Structures are given as structure tokens and as C-alpha cells.
């Protein structure tokens, strides 16, 4: 997207979101990142929404194909599952490449740095969901390490109701439950996060209260499923 203006790529990403053209949206936002400037809060959300929708569709398809493959156990189901898996891995590698070149290293404020480290944990987590080889353990540790650095910053620099801090804790708790086989750690993290946010709600405006309580309900929904 080298010939298109940064502002035009951002505008087109917003149009692509409206049109539910998430592959286009991700391509526009990749082009915007590659301009080399840091991203504002809104632009970070556009980048995250685009890739989360692209990889979300790939993960759903991979799960359908993996289920058919497991029930069947010709080569066609495995071949097609492998094709989808390779495409999914390619998108995760693309996102991780953008974070490494050079979003994370230029992110100095807590809000941006936590945001990008949470993304890094998420995309390693999606790689871990399909991993089966010699590097599976290292993929899981890469997710854990990114989430943990984000957690350490968020606990020092953000209030317990901050929506990024809450969403990071939610996704790290899912990592513990679904990837790391640590359901007790998942439950403890979700409970402590919820309780500390509850005790801080009194400080918030009506609008911030709505933002924080929405994510708290997601933590509670998982705790209801897990306990």
C-alpha cells in the first residue's frame, strides 16, 4: 500500500469495517502501520479489530475442518485443514511481524505498550491453538511471556478498571484455561481482576462505568462457565 497516503489508508480501513470487508481492513491497516509512524488509540483499535476478525474467521473454519478430520480418523480433509491452518499461521506471523517491526519498540506509554503486548500474546495464543510440533512449547511460552510483561505494566501503570487492563486479564485467563492447562490460575486471575475492578467502580463516570462493567461481565461469564 506504499503509494497510498496514511490518512487515506485509515479512512479506507474505516469504510472497510462498515462494509464488513475485514481482509481489506487488515490490508489497509498493515499499510498504515508500515508508514512507520506510531498509531493513535483509535488507529490501534482499527488494527486490532481488522486482524481479530480475519483470524477469527480462520479459527472458526479450522475448528470445523479439524472436527471433521478427527471424526474421519482420503487425504482431502487433512489437506484442506492444512491449507486453512497455513493461512491462519501466515496472518498471525504478519501481525507479529508488525508488532516486532516496529510497533512495540516505539510504544512508550502504558496504554500503547500494554495494548501491543496483549496483541502479541493473543497471536501467539492463536498459533498455539493449532501447534503440534517441536516448537509448540516455545509458542506457548512466547504467549505467556508477552501477556506477563503486559500484566506487569498494567498493574503498575493503570487503574484496575482500565478497559485494556481488564481485557488483558480476560485474555490471559483464557490462555491459562485453554492453552496452559491451568484452570485454577485462570479462575484466580479472573476473580481477582473482577473483585479489584468492582472496588474501583466508585471512581468512574457513567461512561467509564459502562466500559468497565461490560468487560467485568465477560470475566464473570467465564467464571460461571469454569466454576
Amino acid at each position: 500500500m506504499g503509494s497510498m497516503e496514511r490518512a487515506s489508508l485509515i479512512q479506507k480501513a474505516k469504510l472497510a469495517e462498515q462494509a464488513e470487508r475485514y481482509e481489506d481492513m487488515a490490508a489497509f491497516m498493515k499499510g498504515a502501520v508500515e508508514k512507520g509512524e506510531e498509531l493513535s488509540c483509535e488507529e490501534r483499535n482499527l488494527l486490532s479489530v481488522a486482524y481479530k476478525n480475519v483470524v477469527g474467521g480462520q479459527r472458526a473454519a479450522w475448528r470445523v475442518l479439524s472436527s471433521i478430520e478427527q471424526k474421519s480418523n482420503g487425504p482431502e480433509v487433512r489437506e484442506y485443514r492444512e491449507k486453512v491452518e497455513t493461512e491462519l499461521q501466515g496472518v498471525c506471523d504478519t501481525v507479529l511481524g508488525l508488532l516486532d517491526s516496529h510497533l512495540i519498540k516505539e510504544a512508550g506509554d502504558a496504554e500503547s505498550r500494554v495494548f501491543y503486548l496483549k496483541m502479541k500474546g493473543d497471536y501467539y495464543r492463536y498459533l498455539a491453538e493449532v501447534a503440534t510440533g517441536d516448537d509448540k512449547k516455545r509458542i506457548i511460552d512466547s504467549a505467556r511471556s508477552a501477556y506477563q510483561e503486559a500484566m506487569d505494566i498494567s498493574k503498575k501503570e493503570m487503574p484496575p478498571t482500565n478497559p485494556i487492563r481488564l481485557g488483558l486479564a480476560l485474555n490471559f485467563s483464557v490462555f491459562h484455561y485453554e492453552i496452559a492447562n491451568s484452570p485454577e490460575e485462570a479462575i484466580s486471575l479472573a476473580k481477582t481482576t473482577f473483585d479489584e475492578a468492582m472496588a474501583d467502580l466508585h471512581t468512574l463516570s457513567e461512561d467509564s462505568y459502562k466500559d468497565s462493567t461490560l468487560i467485568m461481565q465477560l470475566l464473570r461469564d467465564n467464571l460461571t462457565l469454569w466454576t
Binding site: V49, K52, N171, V174, L225
Partner: peptide
């Protein structure tokens, strides 16, 4: 188990 949505 649900992770964060985009919007």
C-alpha cells in the same frame, strides 16, 4: 470460554 471482542 470467551476472549475479548473487537467492538
Amino acid at each position: 470460554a470467551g476472549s475479548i471482542p473487537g467492538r
